[PDB]
Amino acid sequence: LKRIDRMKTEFIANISHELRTPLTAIKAYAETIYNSLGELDLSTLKEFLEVIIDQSNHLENLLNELLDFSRLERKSLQINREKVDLCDLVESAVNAIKEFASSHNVNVLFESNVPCPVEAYIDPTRIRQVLLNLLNNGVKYSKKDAPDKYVKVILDEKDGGVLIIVEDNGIGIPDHAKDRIFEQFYRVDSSLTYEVPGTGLGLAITKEIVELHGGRIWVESEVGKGSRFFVWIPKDR
Amino acid sequence: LKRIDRMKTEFIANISHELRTPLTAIKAYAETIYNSLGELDLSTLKEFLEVIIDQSNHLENLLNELLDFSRLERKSLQINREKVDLCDLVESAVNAIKEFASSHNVNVLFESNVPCPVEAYIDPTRIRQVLLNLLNNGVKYSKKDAPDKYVKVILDEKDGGVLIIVEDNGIGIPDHAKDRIFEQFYRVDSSLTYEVPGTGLGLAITKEIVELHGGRIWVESEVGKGSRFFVWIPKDR
Amino acid sequence: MSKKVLLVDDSAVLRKIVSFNLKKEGYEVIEAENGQIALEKLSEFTPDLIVLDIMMPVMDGFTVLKKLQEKEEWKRIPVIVLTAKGGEEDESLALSLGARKVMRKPFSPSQFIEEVKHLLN
Amino acid sequence: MSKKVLLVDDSAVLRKIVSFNLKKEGYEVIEAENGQIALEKLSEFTPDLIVLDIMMPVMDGFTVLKKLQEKEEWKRIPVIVLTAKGGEEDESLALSLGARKVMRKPFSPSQFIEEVKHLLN
Ligand SMILES: Nc1ncnc2c1ncn2[C@@H]1O[C@H](COP(=O)(O)OP(=O)(O)O)[C@@H](O)[C@H]1O
Ligand SMILES: Nc1ncnc2c1ncn2[C@@H]1O[C@H](COP(=O)(O)OP(=O)(O)O)[C@@H](O)[C@H]1O
Ligand SMILES: [Mg+2]
Ligand SMILES: [Mg+2]
């Protein structure tokens, strides 16, 4: 029947876990500052404030996922296209993930087999969002201890559209799961997915954004080697 | 036959609304402090930190409702009784809300139609949460502008148990909804409830806590006059 | 003489932090708890800028927006709408009621101030 | 002659704020990124107090707790468990493995320090 109810109840729990960790930081750092102004040098004070700011932006990401989820059940998610240099936009996304990247000892790359600029008629906000989700998963699922971890964006044109690839040194994705990771709420609940923040909404939102552009998304992955996500979008006008 | 999935979807939207408001303050205050160190006197610094701390505590209450919701569905919510003086416990609750109440100029009062101590074998934490929940709605559903707004906890011994009443001069509860307000997710979607935060779980959690104690909860209220929430628990031993 | 900004939102926590950032720039701030009060104060002075929330008791921001572009003195007052209503048609309707810019909550104060400075040039 | 505390949690954000509040009181702090790395450090020294997370890679806090109840010189070390695990069974299991106090997160840094002082006096 409709197991959707049980999947939404686990959704509630995941929301509560994703809210718990930033809130722990925000509460402890804010009350420490409040009780320690005489013991904080300026450098430590700004550092603690930045934790609050960074943790509150994790919560803003959670907020926007719940709103986008509302826009899926309502089938209301829309896009607004405009003439956009896609090279400057992927470069815009690697700067918004580079700090959170090196937080996990991971660099981000952007090769491009095609001359810049690459003009496409797309919704720059949502495509940037798609890029950030794939980049976020690249570092959120990088190999635990191993070094030189990276996530790479390769921009290219193929089959009468633009082909974006997001490749990483990840834990990998099993083949029994490669065909359902794009579904709402679904998450690989393996061993090495312990304290990993997770809604299971990201790739579903990504998929709907990509298809609204008239494109498709798919993945190729081998456990241990990493993952490659392919986004193909028509160029339009 | 299952409207559950419908009410659970608006529950997600209500989580997002409750998440959005404190997060607006936390982000804006944190970034302001960070960029305004030379433009803050010490008192403004501390009060901006207090806003952050107070808004985080709103989020923590949100978090504890999702946790408690998980315990409700899993039928694992559990009380642990101790020998506890109820006169003291109810004062721990009115004090813990006296501040938030004064933010709306609502006075919290406690009258015990009996001699203290009131000894009963209850869960001191969970009964406190019950009192706080109903005292919290007494302030949150106060009449907007109003002369001398109060909320009163009235201790009593009736029908072989303890009768806790929480009366308010609030906006009142319409008669057609006096029964469903204890349902999960249920909120009286009126007009004077526009920008009032809520998930519709407080009373469902309150009702479950009180019944686990062997007691019952019910409400009397007329629109415009006020509300009286009745909580009756056996004394136990 | 410093520019005066009319700040209209039902949340005291919100107006406190917006007022503080406005005064950092040297602006003068006049506060309104709802849309009704906002118009009542506009009969007394004319601000250079209005910051407007949408969801308030008594009178909402959409109604304020429509009333300001019905009075010849107020049509030209630039309005920034700052609202938690991140709806897709929420913005369009605000823009068609005369708003110059619609900004969502949560917001960045610095971005909000860049936009405030921009309309004051 | 200042007391030492071994701080064991997978999160750097958390270790930093807890370490800061511990040194306000003058304690030395040794950090461990997981439970196996923790125990490797109890071979080099013995602390006055252990602060322990539950959910960690490699080795979780539950198995750390019991190995401390095992070894003779670890037996008597106080352990505060500070964890996001909110379950009543999680606390009872942790308590039955020798933890003297379990505190949930989000936690109050000062309530946390009061319990730290209490277990060291
Ligand atoms: N780059 C990646 N490497 C490994 N696993 C991934 C990657 N991207 C997504 N996944 C898996 O797909 C699942 C669904 O992803 P997503 O919808 O983004 O969920 P979440 O919001 O929890 O990240 C996740 O559990 C994750 O295990
Ligand atoms: N003291 C009160 N006065 C008026 N209405 C109330 C009161 N307490 C509860 N209610 C009504 O009961 C409904 C559900 O309350 P509750 O379960 O506490 O959920 P929440 O407070 O999270 O919305 C609300 O719509 C509210 O209007
Ligand atoms: Mg408002
Ligand atoms: Mg952990």
Residue numbers in the entry:
A (entry chain C), B (entry chain A): 244 to 480
C (entry chain B), D (entry chain D): 1 to 121
Paper excerpt:
The bifunctional histidine kinases of bacterial two-component systems possess both phosphoryl transfer activity (kinase) and phosphoryl removal activity (phosphatase) toward their cognate response regulators. After sensing the environmental stimuli, the histidine kinase autophosphorylates a conserved histidine residue in the DHp domain (e.g., H260 of HK853) by its catalytic CA domain, which then transfers the phosphoryl group to an aspartate residue of the receiver domain of its cognate response regulator (RR) (e.g., D53 of RR468). Here we report a molecular mechanism that gates the phosphatase activity of the bifunctional histidine kinase HK853, a member of the HisKA family, from Thermotoga maritima. In summary, our combined solution NMR and crystallographic studies have revealed a pH-gated conformational switch that modulates the phosphatase activity of the largest family of bifunctional histidine kinases.
Our study reveals a pH-mediated conformational change, involving a sidechain rotameric switch of the catalytic histidine residue that inactivates the phosphatase activity of HK853. The two antiparallel helices of the N-terminal DHp domains pack into a central four-helix bundle, with the C-terminal CA domains and the RR468 monomers docking onto and surrounding the central four-helix bundle. The AMPPNP is captured in the hydrolyzed form of ADP, as previously observed. However, a close examination of the conserved and catalytically important histidine residue involved in the pH-dependent change of NMR signals reveals distinct conformations. −-modified D53 of the response regulator RR468; such a configuration would prevent H260 from engaging in the phosphatase activity of HK853 and hence represents a catalytically inactive state. Accompanying the sidechain movement of H260, the inter-domain arrangement of the inactive complex also changed. The N-terminal half of the first helix, which contains H260, was less bent compared to that of the catalytically active structure solved at a higher pH, with the location of the N-terminus of the helix shifting about 2.1 Å. Such a difference in the packing of the DHp domain caused a clockwise rotation of the C-terminal CA domain and the response regulator RR468 around the central helices, resulting in distance shifts between the catalytically inactive and active conformations of as large as ~6.9 and ~2.7 Å for the CA domain and RR468, respectively. Interestingly, although the catalytically inactive conformation reported here has not been previously captured in wild-type enzymes, it has been observed in a “rewired” HK853cp*-RR468* complex, in which the interface residues of HK853 and RR468 from Thermotoga maritima were mutated to match those of the two-component system in Escherichia coli, PhoR and PhoB, respectively.
